[PDB]
A paper describes a structure:
There is a family of proteins that have been shown to enable growth of differentially culturable mycobacteria. These proteins, known as resuscitation-promoting factors (Rpfs), are a class of cell wall remodelling enzymes called lytic transglycosylases (Ltgs) which are ubiquitous to bacteria and some bacteriophages. Ltgs cleave the β-1,4 glycosidic bond between alternating N-Acetylmuramic acid (MurNAc) and N-Acetyl-D-glucosamine (GlcNAc) residues that make up the peptidoglycan backbone. We focused our studies on one of these proteins, [name] (BPSL3046). The presence of multiple Ltgs may suggest functional redundancy, however the results of this study demonstrate that [name] has specific roles in cell division, motility and virulence of [name].
Crystals of [name] were grown at pH 7.5 and diffracted to 1.73 Å resolution. [name] is comprised of two domains, a large β-barrel domain and a smaller α-/β-domain that is an insert of the larger domain. Residues proposed to form part of the catalytic site in the E. coli protein, including the catalytic aspartate (Asp343 in [name]), together with threonine (Thr128) and tyrosine (Tyr130) residues are conserved in [name], suggesting a common catalytic mechanism. To confirm that the aspartate at position 343 was catalytically important, we generated a Asp343Ala (D343A) mutant protein. The mutant eluted from the gel-filtration column at the same position as the wild-type enzyme indicating that it was folded correctly. Zymograms performed using equivalent concentrations of the wildtype and mutant proteins reveal a complete loss of muralytic activity as a result of the mutation, indicated by an absence of clearance under established conditions appropriate for wildtype [name]. The D343A mutation completely abolished the complementation of cellular morphology in ∆ltgGCFD. Thus, our results proved that muralytic activity of [name] was required for its function in [name].
Residue numbers in the entry: 34 to 271, 280 to 372
The structure:
């Protein structure tokens, strides 16, 4: 029932080594559910390249339910190449990312009681502000509200990420991105709850912190004030996941960010790794559709877990050994 496991520390004599599909350990462990969705987004940018025209034409005939036919397609139109680091090692690091998804309103009302703030107009770009607790008390933020959300813990973790999306009670969606900082030190509230015994070793996830906050509503404001850092936001230019560097919406658990000088955008990658909390095998066909400032090296990926806080808790814990095969179209 559980998938193929990595034998660590193996090495290879070439950067790319063609292998048979029968030599990809883990290929049969992937259901392939969702892979055709990310494949069609890939083809939106690749279909007219000479090497991709035939594969993309065939790909448009596949539905997303018949994973038997999708498996036959990948085995027929692509060859897998075992991918090594330039030092010959096959092991590399898989981390994770997500897109925060909050629920808010453009006006303060009902459950929407916690503001996200733009950079305060009464202030000069890049001048140091006080800690969060005094910034919130000075009055300097009043009238600089960008939108009002559902939950102060979600707002806090949106600040940690710097960017995300707010589903508004409109029926519209607002994308927010990085709008500046008070340049004061970050201090994790999860570590605070652990260091002071309020949360057990297991449990300082975003969900465990939300639960503790639910239990201790009159302590929440003081907990958040233990982090002096404060992040501001800007509204981004106006259905599916975020758009990545390839220019297409990312697909949860089927898109990775890569170092594009090692793995060009558009490359499908068979990823063998493990799940962050249970450590079970995770064997997944993904597509290189994004990049990131921390994602540098050869066998290196950021796995896109999807939208919302369960995806973020998986992303937060992901720091797993991994193996890669790059697919190239037979063409």
């Amino acid at each position: 029932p559980a998938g193929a496991a990595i034998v660590p520390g193996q090495i290879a004599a070439a950067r790319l080594t063609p292998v048979a599909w029968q030599q990809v350990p883990g290929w049969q462990d992937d259901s392939l559910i969702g892979a055709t969705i990310a494949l069609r987004q890939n083809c939106a940018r690749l279909a007219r390249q000479a090497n991709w025209q035939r594969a993309c034409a065939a790909a448009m005939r596949l539905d997303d339910l018949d994973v038997g036919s999708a498996r036959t397609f990948f085995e027929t139109y692509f060859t897998p190449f075992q991918f090594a680091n330039n030092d010959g090692t096959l092991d590399g690091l898989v981390t994770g990312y997500y897109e925060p998804l909050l629920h808010g309103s453009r006006v303060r009302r009902g459950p929407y009681q916690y503001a996200l703030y733009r950079w305060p107009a009464g202030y000069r770009a890049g001048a140091s502000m006080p800690a969060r607790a005094q910034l919130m008390r000075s009055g300097a933020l009043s009238g600089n509200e960008l939108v009002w959300v559902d939950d102060p813990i979600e707002a806090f973790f949106l600040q940690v990420q710097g960017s995300g999306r707010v589903v508004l009670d409109d029926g519209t969606v607002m994308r927010v991105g990085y709008g500046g900082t008070n340049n004061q030190p970050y201090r994790s509230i999860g570590k605070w709850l652990l260091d002071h015994g309020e949360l057990g070793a297991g449990q300082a996830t975003m969900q465990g912190i939300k639960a503790w906050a639910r239990a201790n509503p009159s302590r929440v404001d003081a907990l958040l004030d233990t982090n002096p850092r404060f992040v501001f936001f800007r509204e981004m230019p106006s259905a599916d996941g975020p758009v990545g560097a390839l220019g297409v919406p990312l697909t949860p658990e089927r898109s990775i960010a890569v170092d594009p000088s090692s793995i060009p955008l558009g490359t499908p990658v068979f990823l063998q790794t493990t799940r962050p909390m249970t450590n079970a095998p995770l064997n997944r066909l993904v597509f290189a559709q994004d990049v990131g400032t921390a994602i540098k090296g050869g066998v290196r990926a950021d796995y896109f877990w999807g939208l919302g806080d369960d995806a973020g808790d998986q992303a937060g814990r992901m720091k797993q050994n991994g193996r890669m095969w790059l697919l190239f179209p037979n063409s």
